Design a protein around this ligand. Structure first.
Ligand SMILES: Nc1ncnc2c1ncn2[C@@H]1O[C@H](COP(=O)(O)OP(=O)(O)OC[C@H]2O[C@@H](O)[C@H](O)[C@@H]2O)[C@@H](O)[C@H]1O
Ligand SMILES: [Zn+2]
Length: 274
């Protein structure tokens, strides 16, 4: 599905630094910062993307299977995952919209009330009856919104996976929160997504339409490149490491899988430059 296997682009060191300083500036000056993440933020942990050079669909085109260097369970959040945890803690991230099913945002300790997982989460099952969600320690075992073989404990209703199939519509609440955050954002930053899937890929444009700024961080071209105020071509982990340095923020260490349901008030953060 969509455009697969396009050549990657790398801003050279001085181009990159200048662009990351510009991004820092946009973050400092924007009250509402919304991040939009795709499969590219998980490749540095061993999970292949879909449309990159060895992406799932690109490889399918060659009659090759995708290569994982991890199970979903033994996957570690990347520096990028952890940077987003910290940005949220200090109040420099309003909301996070993800297209990833890998479960890494949740397991990194990102508060679920500021997270929309538009395409589902491998570790989450949902009661058909009450709609209460269960975050599990291991992948649920089914995809396509199917019965997992477990009953709810809030009820005895049927538990199903939340992995959307091709024809399946997006979770009502997640999309509602994603829309609200994107329309009301001063700044949308996309990370490691080619922005080819609607409505997910068009959400960062709602920010642009409403007068806000748009930053696209990606190794390949994306569908909405022409609409961005800043395009940054580099490994996300590098882009984020440099950004956090400029912002004067530590990237916290991951202590293993942890679920946080609700965000706290912002922690102290350094003062803004002149
Ligand atoms: N370390 C990295 N740093 C920066 N960019 C990266 C990195 N690794 C990969 N990328 C880029 O990330 C992008 C990932 O885009 P896709 O593979 O299309 O993944 P995504 O946009 O998340 O896909 C959207 C949706 O498509 C469906 O197949 C599936 O439902 C998925 O959630 C690619 O353009 C690739 O160049
Ligand atoms: Zn129930």
């Amino acid at each position: 599905k969509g455009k697969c296997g396009l050549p990657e682009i790398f801003d050279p060191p001085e181009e990159l630094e200048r662009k990351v300083w510009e991004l820092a500036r946009l973050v400092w000056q924007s009250s509402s910062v919304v991040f939009h993440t795709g499969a590219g933020i998980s490749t540095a942990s061993g999970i292949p993307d879909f449309r990159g050079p060895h992406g799932v669909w690109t490889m399918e085109e060659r009659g090759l299977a995708p290569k994982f260097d991890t199970t979903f369970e033994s996957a570690r959040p990347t520096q990028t995952h952890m940077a987003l945890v910290q940005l949220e803690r200090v109040g420099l991230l309003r909301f996070l919209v993800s297209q990833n099913v890998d479960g890494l945002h949740v397991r990194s300790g990102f508060p679920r009330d500021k997270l929309a997982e538009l395409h589902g989460n491998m570790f989450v099952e949902e009661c058909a009856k009450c709609k209460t969600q269960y975050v599990r320690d291991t992948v649920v075992g089914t995809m396509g919104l199917k019965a997992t073989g477990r009953l709810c404990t809030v009820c005895r209703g049927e538990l199903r996976d939340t992995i959307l199939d091709w024809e399946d519509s997006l979770p009502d609440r997640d999309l509602a929160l994603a829309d609200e955050a994107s329309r009301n954002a001063d700044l949308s930053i996309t990370l490691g997504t080619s922005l080819q899937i609607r409505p997910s890929g068009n959400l960062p444009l709602a920010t642009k339409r409403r007068g806000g700024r748009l930053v696209i961080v990606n190794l390949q071209p994306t569908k909405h490149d022409r609409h961005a105020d800043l395009r940054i071509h580099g490994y996300v982990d590098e882009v984020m490491t440099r950004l956090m340095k400029h912002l004067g923020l530590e990237i916290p260490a991951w202590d293993g899988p942890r679920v946080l349901e609700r965000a706290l008030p912002p922690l102290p953060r350094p003062p803004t430059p002149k």
